[PDB]
Coordinates of C-alpha atoms in Angstrom, one line a residue:
Chain A
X1 CA 72.1 101.2 125.3
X2 CA 75.9 101.8 125.3
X3 CA 76.0 102.1 121.4
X4 CA 73.0 104.5 121.5
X5 CA 74.7 106.6 124.1
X6 CA 78.0 106.7 122.2
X7 CA 76.2 107.8 119.0
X8 CA 74.3 110.5 120.8
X9 CA 77.5 111.8 122.3
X10 CA 79.3 111.9 119.0
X11 CA 76.4 113.7 117.3
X12 CA 76.3 116.2 120.1
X13 CA 80.0 116.8 119.8
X14 CA 79.9 117.2 115.9
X15 CA 78.2 120.7 116.2
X16 CA 80.7 122.0 118.8
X17 CA 83.6 120.7 116.6
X18 CA 82.2 122.5 113.5
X19 CA 81.7 125.7 115.5
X20 CA 85.1 125.7 117.1
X21 CA 87.2 124.8 114.0
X22 CA 88.3 128.1 112.3
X23 CA 88.8 126.6 108.7
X24 CA 86.3 123.8 108.8
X25 CA 84.3 125.3 105.8
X26 CA 87.4 126.4 103.9
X27 CA 86.6 124.9 100.5
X28 CA 83.2 126.7 99.9
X29 CA 84.7 129.9 101.1
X30 CA 87.6 129.6 98.7
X31 CA 85.2 128.9 95.8
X32 CA 83.2 132.0 96.7
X33 CA 86.3 134.2 97.1
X34 CA 87.8 133.1 93.8
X35 CA 84.6 133.9 92.0
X36 CA 84.4 137.3 93.7
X37 CA 88.1 138.1 92.9
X38 CA 87.7 137.2 89.3
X39 CA 84.8 139.5 88.9
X40 CA 86.6 142.3 90.8
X41 CA 89.7 142.1 88.6
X42 CA 87.5 142.0 85.5
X43 CA 85.7 145.1 86.6
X44 CA 88.8 147.0 87.7
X45 CA 90.7 146.2 84.4
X46 CA 88.4 148.7 82.6
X47 CA 90.3 151.6 84.1
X48 CA 93.5 150.6 82.2
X49 CA 94.7 152.7 79.3
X50 CA 96.5 149.9 77.4
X51 CA 98.8 152.6 75.8
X52 CA 96.0 155.1 74.9
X53 CA 96.2 158.7 75.9
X54 CA 93.1 158.1 78.2
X55 CA 91.0 155.1 79.3
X56 CA 87.6 156.8 78.9
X57 CA 86.1 156.9 75.4
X58 CA 84.4 160.2 75.4
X59 CA 87.6 162.2 75.8
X60 CA 89.2 160.2 73.0
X61 CA 86.4 160.8 70.6
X62 CA 86.0 164.5 71.8
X63 CA 89.6 165.8 71.3
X64 CA 91.0 163.7 68.5
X65 CA 90.4 163.4 64.8
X66 CA 88.8 160.2 63.5
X67 CA 91.8 159.0 61.6
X68 CA 93.8 158.9 64.8
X69 CA 90.7 158.0 66.8
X70 CA 90.3 154.6 65.1
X71 CA 93.8 153.5 66.0
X72 CA 93.6 155.0 69.5
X73 CA 90.4 153.0 70.1
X74 CA 91.7 149.7 68.7
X75 CA 94.2 149.4 71.6
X76 CA 91.4 149.6 74.2
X77 CA 89.3 147.2 72.2
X78 CA 92.0 144.6 72.0
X79 CA 93.0 145.0 75.6
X80 CA 89.5 144.5 76.8
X81 CA 88.9 141.5 74.5
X82 CA 92.1 139.9 76.0
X83 CA 90.8 140.5 79.5
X84 CA 87.4 139.0 78.7
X85 CA 89.0 135.9 77.0
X86 CA 91.3 135.4 80.0
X87 CA 88.3 135.6 82.4
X88 CA 86.4 133.0 80.3
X89 CA 89.3 130.6 80.1
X90 CA 89.9 130.7 84.0
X91 CA 86.1 130.1 84.3
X92 CA 86.3 127.0 82.2
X93 CA 89.2 125.5 84.2
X94 CA 87.5 126.2 87.5
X95 CA 84.2 124.7 86.2
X96 CA 86.1 121.5 85.2
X97 CA 87.5 121.3 88.7
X98 CA 84.0 121.9 90.2
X99 CA 82.5 119.2 88.0
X100 CA 85.1 116.7 89.2
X101 CA 84.3 117.5 92.8
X102 CA 80.5 117.2 92.1
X103 CA 81.1 113.7 90.5
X104 CA 83.0 112.6 93.6
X105 CA 80.1 114.0 95.8
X106 CA 77.5 112.0 93.8
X107 CA 79.5 108.9 94.0
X108 CA 79.8 109.3 97.8
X109 CA 76.0 110.0 98.1
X110 CA 75.2 106.8 96.1
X111 CA 77.7 104.5 97.9
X112 CA 77.9 105.9 101.5
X113 CA 74.3 107.2 102.1
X114 CA 72.2 104.7 100.0
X115 CA 74.2 101.7 101.0
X116 CA 77.2 100.3 103.1
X117 CA 80.6 100.5 101.4
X118 CA 83.4 98.1 102.0
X119 CA 86.0 100.4 100.4
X120 CA 88.7 101.3 102.9
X121 CA 88.8 105.0 104.0
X122 CA 86.1 106.0 101.5
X123 CA 83.1 106.6 103.8
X124 CA 85.3 107.9 106.6
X125 CA 88.0 106.4 108.7
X126 CA 87.2 103.1 110.4
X127 CA 84.7 100.3 109.5
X128 CA 81.9 102.2 107.8
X129 CA 78.4 101.8 109.4
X130 CA 76.3 104.4 107.8
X131 CA 76.2 108.1 106.7
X132 CA 74.0 111.1 106.7
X133 CA 73.8 114.1 104.2
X134 CA 73.4 117.8 105.1
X135 CA 73.0 120.7 102.7
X136 CA 75.4 123.7 102.5
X137 CA 75.2 127.0 100.6
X138 CA 77.3 125.6 97.7
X139 CA 78.0 122.0 98.7
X140 CA 77.2 119.0 100.8
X141 CA 78.4 117.7 104.2
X142 CA 78.6 114.0 104.9
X143 CA 78.3 112.7 108.5
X144 CA 80.0 109.2 108.5
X145 CA 79.2 106.9 111.4
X146 CA 81.9 104.3 111.7
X147 CA 83.1 101.5 114.0
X148 CA 86.5 101.6 115.8
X149 CA 87.9 98.7 117.8
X150 CA 89.5 99.4 121.1
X151 CA 91.0 97.8 124.3
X152 CA 93.0 95.1 122.6
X153 CA 94.5 92.1 124.5
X154 CA 97.3 89.7 123.7
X155 CA 96.8 86.0 123.1
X156 CA 98.6 82.9 121.9
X157 CA 97.2 81.5 118.7
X158 CA 97.5 78.3 116.6
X159 CA 96.5 77.7 112.9
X160 CA 94.9 74.4 113.6
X161 CA 94.0 71.8 116.2
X162 CA 95.2 68.1 116.0
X163 CA 92.6 65.7 117.4
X164 CA 92.4 61.9 116.8
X165 CA 95.1 62.2 114.1
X166 CA 93.1 64.8 112.1
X167 CA 93.5 68.5 111.7
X168 CA 90.6 71.0 112.6
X169 CA 90.4 74.5 111.3
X170 CA 87.9 77.2 112.5
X171 CA 84.9 77.8 110.3
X172 CA 84.9 81.5 111.1
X173 CA 87.3 82.9 113.7
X174 CA 90.6 82.2 115.4
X175 CA 91.9 79.6 117.9
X176 CA 92.9 81.5 121.1
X177 CA 94.5 80.3 124.3
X178 CA 94.2 82.3 127.6
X179 CA 97.3 80.5 128.8
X180 CA 95.7 77.2 129.7
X181 CA 92.6 76.6 127.7
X182 CA 91.8 77.0 124.0
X183 CA 88.7 78.7 122.5
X184 CA 87.3 79.9 119.2
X185 CA 86.6 83.6 118.8
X186 CA 85.5 86.0 116.1
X187 CA 88.2 88.1 114.6
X188 CA 87.0 91.6 115.3
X189 CA 85.6 91.0 118.9
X190 CA 86.6 88.8 121.8
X191 CA 83.9 86.3 122.6
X192 CA 85.4 82.9 123.5
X193 CA 83.6 79.7 122.9
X194 CA 84.2 75.9 123.3
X195 CA 85.9 74.3 120.3
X196 CA 83.4 71.9 119.1
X197 CA 82.5 70.1 115.8
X198 CA 79.9 72.7 114.9
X199 CA 82.4 75.6 114.7
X200 CA 85.4 73.6 113.1
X201 CA 85.9 71.6 110.0
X202 CA 88.4 68.7 109.3
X203 CA 90.8 68.5 106.4
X204 CA 93.6 66.0 106.4
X205 CA 95.9 64.6 109.1
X206 CA 97.8 66.8 111.6
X207 CA 101.4 66.4 110.5
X208 CA 101.4 68.7 107.4
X209 CA 100.5 72.1 109.0
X210 CA 103.4 74.0 110.5
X211 CA 102.5 75.1 114.1
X212 CA 99.7 72.6 114.8
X213 CA 98.9 72.0 118.5
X214 CA 97.1 69.2 120.3
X215 CA 93.8 69.8 122.0
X216 CA 90.5 68.0 122.5
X217 CA 87.6 68.8 120.1
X218 CA 84.2 68.4 121.9
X219 CA 81.2 66.8 120.1
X220 CA 77.7 67.3 121.5
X221 CA 76.4 64.0 120.2
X222 CA 78.7 61.7 122.1
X223 CA 77.6 62.7 125.7
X224 CA 74.0 61.8 124.9
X225 CA 74.9 58.1 124.6
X226 CA 71.2 57.1 124.2
Chain B
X1 CA 119.8 135.1 114.0
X2 CA 120.8 133.9 110.5
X3 CA 120.4 130.3 109.3
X4 CA 121.0 128.6 105.9
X5 CA 118.5 126.0 104.6
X6 CA 118.3 124.3 101.2
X7 CA 115.3 126.6 100.5
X8 CA 117.4 129.8 101.1
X9 CA 118.4 131.7 104.1
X10 CA 116.2 132.6 107.1
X11 CA 116.7 135.7 109.3
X12 CA 114.9 136.4 112.6
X13 CA 114.4 132.7 113.6
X14 CA 116.6 130.4 115.6
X15 CA 117.2 126.8 114.7
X16 CA 116.4 124.2 117.4
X17 CA 117.1 120.4 117.5
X18 CA 113.7 119.4 118.7
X19 CA 111.2 118.3 116.1
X20 CA 107.4 119.1 116.1
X21 CA 104.5 118.5 113.8
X22 CA 105.0 121.8 112.0
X23 CA 102.4 124.4 111.1
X24 CA 104.2 127.0 108.9
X25 CA 106.0 125.2 106.0
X26 CA 109.2 126.8 104.9
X27 CA 110.5 124.0 102.7
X28 CA 113.0 121.1 102.3
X29 CA 111.7 119.6 105.6
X30 CA 112.2 122.9 107.4
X31 CA 109.3 124.5 109.2
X32 CA 108.7 127.4 111.7
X33 CA 106.4 128.2 114.6
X34 CA 105.9 130.6 117.5
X35 CA 107.4 129.3 120.7
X36 CA 105.7 131.4 123.4
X37 CA 108.6 134.9 122.8
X38 CA 110.5 134.0 119.7
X39 CA 110.2 132.3 116.2
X40 CA 112.0 128.9 115.9
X41 CA 113.0 126.8 113.0
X42 CA 113.1 123.0 113.0
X43 CA 112.8 119.8 111.1
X44 CA 109.4 118.0 110.7
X45 CA 108.5 115.0 112.8
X46 CA 106.4 112.5 110.9
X47 CA 104.7 111.2 114.1
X48 CA 105.6 109.0 117.0
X49 CA 107.6 105.7 116.6
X50 CA 105.6 102.5 117.3
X51 CA 107.3 99.1 117.2
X52 CA 104.4 96.6 117.3
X53 CA 105.3 93.4 119.1
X54 CA 105.5 90.9 116.2
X55 CA 105.7 87.2 117.1
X56 CA 105.2 83.9 115.3
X57 CA 102.3 82.7 117.5
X58 CA 100.9 85.9 119.1
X59 CA 97.6 87.7 118.2
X60 CA 96.0 90.9 119.4
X61 CA 92.2 91.0 119.6
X62 CA 90.0 93.9 120.6
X63 CA 87.7 93.5 123.6
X64 CA 85.7 96.8 123.2
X65 CA 84.7 99.3 120.6
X66 CA 83.7 102.9 120.0
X67 CA 81.5 104.5 117.3
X68 CA 82.6 107.7 115.7
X69 CA 81.1 110.4 113.6
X70 CA 83.3 112.3 111.1
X71 CA 82.5 115.2 108.8
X72 CA 83.4 115.6 105.1
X73 CA 82.7 118.8 103.0
Chain C
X1 CA 101.8 106.7 88.9
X2 CA 103.0 110.3 88.9
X3 CA 102.1 112.3 92.0
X4 CA 103.5 115.8 91.5
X5 CA 105.5 118.2 89.3
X6 CA 108.1 120.9 89.8
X7 CA 107.2 124.1 91.5
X8 CA 108.1 127.2 89.6
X9 CA 107.8 130.9 90.1
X10 CA 108.2 133.9 87.8
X11 CA 109.2 137.5 88.2
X12 CA 107.0 139.6 85.8
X13 CA 109.2 142.7 85.3
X14 CA 112.5 140.9 85.4
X15 CA 111.4 138.4 82.7
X16 CA 109.8 141.2 80.6
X17 CA 112.6 143.7 80.4
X18 CA 115.1 142.8 83.1
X19 CA 114.7 145.7 85.6
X20 CA 114.5 148.7 83.1
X21 CA 113.1 151.9 84.5
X22 CA 111.4 153.3 81.5
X23 CA 110.1 149.9 80.5
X24 CA 108.7 149.3 84.0
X25 CA 107.0 152.7 83.9
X26 CA 105.4 151.7 80.6
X27 CA 104.5 148.3 82.0
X28 CA 102.6 149.5 85.1
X29 CA 99.9 150.9 82.9
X30 CA 98.7 147.5 81.7
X31 CA 96.8 146.6 84.9
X32 CA 97.2 143.5 87.2
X33 CA 98.3 140.8 84.8
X34 CA 101.4 140.0 86.9
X35 CA 99.4 139.7 90.1
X36 CA 97.1 137.1 88.4
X37 CA 99.9 135.1 87.0
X38 CA 101.8 135.0 90.3
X39 CA 98.6 133.9 92.1
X40 CA 98.1 131.1 89.6
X41 CA 101.6 129.8 90.0
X42 CA 101.4 130.0 93.8
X43 CA 98.2 128.1 93.7
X44 CA 99.8 125.4 91.5
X45 CA 102.7 125.1 93.9
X46 CA 100.4 124.7 96.9
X47 CA 98.4 122.1 95.1
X48 CA 101.5 120.1 94.3
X49 CA 102.5 120.0 98.0
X50 CA 99.0 119.1 99.0
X51 CA 99.0 116.2 96.4
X52 CA 102.2 114.8 97.9
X53 CA 100.7 115.0 101.4
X54 CA 97.5 113.4 100.4
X55 CA 99.2 110.4 98.7
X56 CA 101.9 109.6 101.1
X57 CA 101.0 110.9 104.6
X58 CA 98.2 108.5 105.4
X59 CA 99.7 106.5 108.3
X60 CA 99.2 108.0 111.7
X61 CA 102.4 106.5 113.4
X62 CA 105.8 105.5 112.2
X63 CA 105.7 101.7 112.5
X64 CA 109.0 99.9 112.8
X65 CA 110.1 96.5 111.4
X66 CA 110.9 93.8 114.1
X67 CA 114.6 92.9 114.3
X68 CA 113.9 89.2 113.9
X69 CA 112.9 89.2 110.2
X70 CA 111.3 85.8 109.7
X71 CA 107.7 85.8 108.3
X72 CA 107.1 82.1 107.7
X73 CA 109.3 81.7 104.7
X74 CA 108.4 84.9 102.9
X75 CA 111.3 87.2 101.9
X76 CA 110.7 90.9 102.0
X77 CA 114.4 91.8 101.6
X78 CA 113.9 93.5 98.2
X79 CA 111.2 95.9 99.5
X80 CA 112.3 96.5 103.1
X81 CA 114.7 99.5 103.7
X82 CA 118.4 98.7 103.6
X83 CA 120.3 100.3 106.6
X84 CA 123.7 99.8 105.1
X85 CA 123.4 102.5 102.5
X86 CA 123.0 106.0 103.9
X87 CA 119.9 106.5 101.7
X88 CA 118.0 103.9 103.8
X89 CA 116.1 102.9 100.6
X90 CA 115.2 99.4 99.4
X91 CA 117.2 98.0 96.5
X92 CA 114.0 98.5 94.3
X93 CA 113.8 102.1 95.4
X94 CA 117.4 102.8 94.5
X95 CA 116.9 101.1 91.2
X96 CA 113.9 103.4 90.5
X97 CA 115.8 106.5 91.5
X98 CA 118.7 105.6 89.3
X99 CA 116.6 104.7 86.3
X100 CA 115.0 108.1 86.0
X101 CA 117.3 111.1 86.2
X102 CA 117.8 114.5 84.4
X103 CA 117.7 132.4 84.7
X104 CA 115.7 135.6 83.8
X105 CA 113.4 135.8 86.8
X106 CA 112.4 132.1 86.7
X107 CA 113.1 129.9 89.7
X108 CA 112.4 126.4 91.0
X109 CA 111.0 126.1 94.6
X110 CA 112.1 122.9 96.3
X111 CA 109.4 120.5 97.5
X112 CA 108.3 120.5 101.1
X113 CA 108.8 116.8 101.9
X114 CA 112.2 115.6 101.1
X115 CA 112.8 112.1 99.4
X116 CA 114.1 110.7 102.8
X117 CA 110.8 111.6 104.5
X118 CA 108.8 109.9 101.7
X119 CA 111.0 106.8 102.0
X120 CA 110.3 106.8 105.7
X121 CA 106.5 107.0 105.1
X122 CA 106.8 104.1 102.7
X123 CA 108.8 102.1 105.2
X124 CA 106.1 102.8 107.9
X125 CA 103.3 101.6 105.5
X126 CA 105.3 98.5 104.7
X127 CA 106.1 97.7 108.4
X128 CA 102.4 98.2 109.2
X129 CA 101.0 96.0 106.5
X130 CA 103.5 93.2 107.2
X131 CA 103.1 93.1 110.9
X132 CA 99.4 93.9 111.4
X133 CA 97.6 93.1 108.2
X134 CA 94.8 95.5 107.4
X135 CA 94.0 96.3 111.0
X136 CA 96.3 99.3 111.2
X137 CA 94.4 101.2 108.6
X138 CA 91.1 101.1 110.5
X139 CA 92.4 101.8 114.0
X140 CA 95.0 100.5 116.4
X141 CA 97.5 98.1 114.9
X142 CA 97.0 94.5 116.1
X143 CA 99.8 92.0 115.5
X144 CA 99.1 88.7 113.7
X145 CA 101.4 86.0 112.3
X146 CA 101.9 86.5 108.6
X147 CA 100.7 83.0 107.4
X148 CA 97.5 83.6 109.4
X149 CA 97.1 87.0 107.5
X150 CA 97.6 85.2 104.2
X151 CA 95.0 82.6 105.2
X152 CA 92.6 85.5 105.9
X153 CA 93.3 86.9 102.4
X154 CA 92.8 83.5 100.8
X155 CA 89.4 83.4 102.6
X156 CA 88.8 86.9 101.2
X157 CA 89.3 85.7 97.6
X158 CA 87.0 82.7 98.2
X159 CA 89.5 79.9 99.0
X160 CA 89.4 77.9 102.2
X161 CA 92.3 78.6 104.6
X162 CA 93.5 75.0 104.8
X163 CA 94.6 75.3 101.1
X164 CA 97.1 77.8 102.3
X165 CA 98.4 75.8 105.3
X166 CA 99.0 72.7 103.1
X167 CA 101.0 74.6 100.4
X168 CA 102.8 77.2 102.5
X169 CA 106.3 76.4 101.3
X170 CA 105.2 76.4 97.6
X171 CA 103.4 79.7 98.0
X172 CA 106.4 81.3 99.8
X173 CA 108.8 80.0 97.0
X174 CA 106.5 81.4 94.3
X175 CA 106.3 84.8 96.0
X176 CA 110.1 84.9 96.5
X177 CA 110.6 84.1 92.8
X178 CA 108.2 86.7 91.6
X179 CA 109.7 89.4 93.8
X180 CA 113.1 88.5 92.6
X181 CA 112.1 88.7 89.0
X182 CA 110.4 92.1 89.6
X183 CA 113.7 93.9 89.8
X184 CA 115.1 92.3 86.7
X185 CA 111.9 93.1 84.9
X186 CA 112.1 96.8 85.9
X187 CA 115.8 97.0 85.0
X188 CA 115.6 95.4 81.6
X189 CA 112.5 97.3 80.4
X190 CA 113.5 100.2 78.0
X191 CA 110.6 102.6 79.0
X192 CA 109.1 101.2 82.2
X193 CA 109.3 104.7 83.9
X194 CA 107.9 106.6 80.9
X195 CA 105.3 108.7 82.8
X196 CA 107.7 110.3 85.3
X197 CA 110.2 111.0 82.5
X198 CA 107.4 112.5 80.4
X199 CA 106.4 114.9 83.2
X200 CA 110.0 116.0 83.7
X201 CA 110.6 116.5 80.0
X202 CA 107.4 118.5 79.6
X203 CA 108.4 120.8 82.4
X204 CA 111.9 121.2 81.0
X205 CA 110.8 122.0 77.5
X206 CA 108.2 124.5 78.7
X207 CA 110.9 126.3 80.7
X208 CA 113.3 126.1 77.7
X209 CA 110.9 127.5 75.2
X210 CA 109.8 130.3 77.7
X211 CA 113.5 131.3 78.0
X212 CA 114.2 131.1 74.3
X213 CA 111.1 133.1 73.2
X214 CA 112.9 136.3 74.6
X215 CA 115.1 136.4 71.5
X216 CA 112.1 137.1 69.3
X217 CA 111.5 140.6 68.1
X218 CA 107.7 140.5 67.6
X219 CA 108.0 143.2 64.9
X220 CA 110.3 145.6 66.7
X221 CA 113.5 146.8 65.2
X222 CA 115.6 144.8 67.7
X223 CA 115.2 142.2 70.5
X224 CA 117.5 143.8 73.1
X225 CA 116.3 146.7 75.1
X226 CA 119.6 148.6 75.0
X227 CA 119.8 149.1 71.2
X228 CA 116.2 150.3 71.0
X229 CA 116.5 152.7 73.9
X230 CA 120.0 153.9 72.9
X231 CA 119.9 154.8 69.1
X232 CA 116.3 155.9 68.9
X233 CA 114.2 158.8 70.2
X234 CA 112.0 158.2 73.2
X235 CA 108.8 158.9 71.3
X236 CA 109.6 156.1 68.9
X237 CA 111.2 154.0 71.7
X238 CA 107.8 153.9 73.5
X239 CA 106.1 152.3 70.4
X240 CA 109.0 150.0 69.8
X241 CA 108.9 148.7 73.3
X242 CA 105.1 148.3 73.3
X243 CA 105.4 145.5 70.9
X244 CA 108.0 143.6 72.9
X245 CA 106.0 144.0 76.1
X246 CA 102.8 142.7 74.7
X247 CA 104.5 139.8 72.9
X248 CA 106.3 138.7 76.1
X249 CA 103.1 139.2 78.2
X250 CA 101.2 136.9 75.7
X251 CA 104.0 134.2 75.9
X252 CA 104.0 134.3 79.7
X253 CA 100.1 134.1 79.8
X254 CA 100.3 131.0 77.4
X255 CA 102.9 129.4 79.7
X256 CA 100.8 129.9 82.8
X257 CA 97.7 128.4 81.1
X258 CA 99.5 125.2 79.9
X259 CA 100.9 124.9 83.5
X260 CA 97.3 125.1 84.9
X261 CA 96.0 122.4 82.6
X262 CA 99.0 120.1 83.4
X263 CA 98.5 120.7 87.1
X264 CA 94.9 119.6 86.8
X265 CA 96.0 116.4 85.1
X266 CA 98.6 115.8 87.8
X267 CA 95.9 116.4 90.5
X268 CA 93.7 113.7 88.9
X269 CA 96.6 111.2 88.8
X270 CA 97.4 111.9 92.4
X271 CA 93.8 111.4 93.5
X272 CA 93.9 108.0 91.8
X273 CA 97.1 107.2 93.6
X274 CA 95.7 108.2 96.9
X275 CA 92.7 105.9 96.3
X276 CA 95.0 103.1 95.3
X277 CA 96.9 103.5 98.5
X278 CA 93.8 103.5 100.6
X279 CA 92.2 100.4 99.0
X280 CA 95.0 98.2 97.6
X281 CA 97.6 98.7 100.4
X282 CA 95.5 99.4 103.5
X283 CA 92.9 96.7 102.6
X284 CA 91.8 94.0 100.2
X285 CA 89.7 95.1 97.2
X286 CA 87.1 93.1 95.5
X287 CA 87.0 95.4 92.6
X288 CA 88.0 93.7 89.4
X289 CA 91.3 94.7 87.6
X290 CA 91.8 97.6 90.1
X291 CA 94.6 96.2 92.3
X292 CA 96.3 94.4 89.5
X293 CA 95.3 91.5 87.3
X294 CA 93.8 88.4 89.0
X295 CA 92.4 88.0 92.4
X296 CA 94.0 90.6 94.6
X297 CA 95.9 89.4 97.7
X298 CA 97.9 92.4 98.8
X299 CA 100.0 95.3 97.6
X300 CA 103.2 97.1 98.6
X301 CA 104.1 100.8 98.0
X302 CA 107.5 102.1 96.8
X303 CA 108.6 105.7 96.4
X304 CA 109.8 107.2 93.1
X305 CA 111.4 110.6 92.3
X306 CA 108.0 112.0 91.4
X307 CA 105.5 109.3 92.0
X308 CA 104.6 105.9 93.5
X309 CA 105.1 102.3 92.3
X310 CA 102.6 99.7 93.5
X311 CA 103.5 95.9 93.7
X312 CA 100.2 94.1 93.5
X313 CA 100.4 90.4 94.6
Chain D
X1 CA 78.0 64.6 99.5
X2 CA 76.4 64.6 102.9
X3 CA 73.7 66.5 104.7
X4 CA 76.3 68.7 106.3
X5 CA 77.4 70.4 103.1
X6 CA 73.9 70.4 101.4
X7 CA 70.5 71.9 102.0
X8 CA 67.1 70.7 101.1
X9 CA 64.6 72.9 99.2
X10 CA 61.5 71.3 97.7
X11 CA 61.0 68.1 95.7
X12 CA 63.1 67.0 92.7
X13 CA 60.5 67.4 89.9
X14 CA 60.8 71.2 89.4
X15 CA 64.6 71.7 88.8
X16 CA 65.8 71.1 85.2
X17 CA 68.8 68.8 85.0
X18 CA 68.5 67.1 88.4
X19 CA 70.3 63.7 88.8
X20 CA 69.9 60.9 91.1
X21 CA 72.6 60.1 93.8
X22 CA 72.9 59.0 97.4
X23 CA 73.3 61.7 100.2
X24 CA 75.2 60.2 103.0
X25 CA 73.7 60.9 106.5
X26 CA 76.4 60.8 109.1
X27 CA 74.0 59.9 111.9
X28 CA 72.6 56.5 110.8
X29 CA 75.9 54.5 111.2
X30 CA 76.7 55.7 114.7
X31 CA 73.1 56.3 115.8
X32 CA 74.6 57.4 119.1

């Protein structure tokens, strides 16, 4: 119930966060603005004269003899060809950048949405749980649901436990003392348990490990005694 | 007033000794912002200082958790 | 890995014909080339600053190293900051900075983050990874003894933790020997820092050839403006300056295009470096041959004049 | 080789390359 409530609250806050942020959708807007600016400058550059007496053709061919008309038109031709070539080159560079971004988006869709990724800070910040895609006018939005630990507590820890002259290590977890008693817990969440033979394994005597402490290791079979 | 920075000279902003997470980058570690009344210039602060309590037998273990949703565009 | 390049700006008219009135009047009829070039260079500079921010400013808080510097026999003295020298850099960082070293409207904008701030970021990352393992990259930093962290990592590569606890002295000695040999290997190598030097040299030669191309005539009777505008009639001066203007404009456009291509390559490299910082340093990666050769245990970042050096254990 | 670090799955005539050895049960000696 707590996890469901937290998820619902986070999803509800997502829409308000998107609405309130002024530059949340900046990248798509920059793409659109760059395309529009390139088109606008290409259109406006037709008005330049490039050294000719006039920029419009009809006046040039109307009031000038053909021998001078050819050389007066060549300037406009070469200037406009240069402008168009520049536009195409800028478009090629921008297309390469967009292709790299789309490759990254496809990788994120494959690894964050269709699975669970263990790569750090790839599917969002925190331990990645799952992800959701959402469409955009020229892109995609990923909603990463991740797990964040909180409310930490300090403890005294030991690497191993010496019992009956042999050393015991935890199968999965950490030896933790609350000041007086020792327990085994999982690393990412506090859930103490009795140190027994089921959740520990033995390897060697207890004089080689640095920092080994003495404690009893319970075995469920002995108390039966039947 | 007039101030001299490794990025040039700045006129119309006063230099203060307090550091903030800056919003208008000027350069060479110098940033500017609106006080609110005047424009100030300062050096960046890279976040708060946190000296974690390291020990040879102490461990920190979380007792609760939160789940968070983050957007990527 | 290189992370960024130098930020440069150009003055169109000053480069073209060094503040000449008749030439400027003749130039303003060509359209808005100068605006386009200035916008492109501004975008390149902003991208460089963003690359640096993305690679280095990942940690949320400035973590500080404990004063009692004992970590179960492991010696981090070569990578921890040295407070004796005013630079507050590690010996490896100082060696890196020493190994690689080095108008007409052209200028060089300084970077936003200074070298000292980048060193502080690297120190914070090192302190976090040494005192808290990988926990500081997913949320709050939780302290843990370093041998227990190393046992965690041995479990991560598929070896039982007891194997670490029965060989702790040998493993510490091997780590210390390897870290000691790292500095000698970097120093003795002839071209260990080749990538950063190549970036610097490419920028320098681009600027040098841009400056040198001004002496070209491009078919005009002379290269200097004064001789053309002094001993020739204005009707012929116009056509004689047209060639110089168009040639210099073409050269400037070529320079800007090569700068754009190089900036794209540097952006790719910086994205790779940011991914390596996220996965090698802030965690333990199971990807093969990504965080070094072998089974990855951990990694340490070090700053460079224009990039990053990763120490994969 | 004990029953603690091994698991049983089927009889020993389907697997190719199976060999014969004793698997030590740590209950029989003590027997509680």
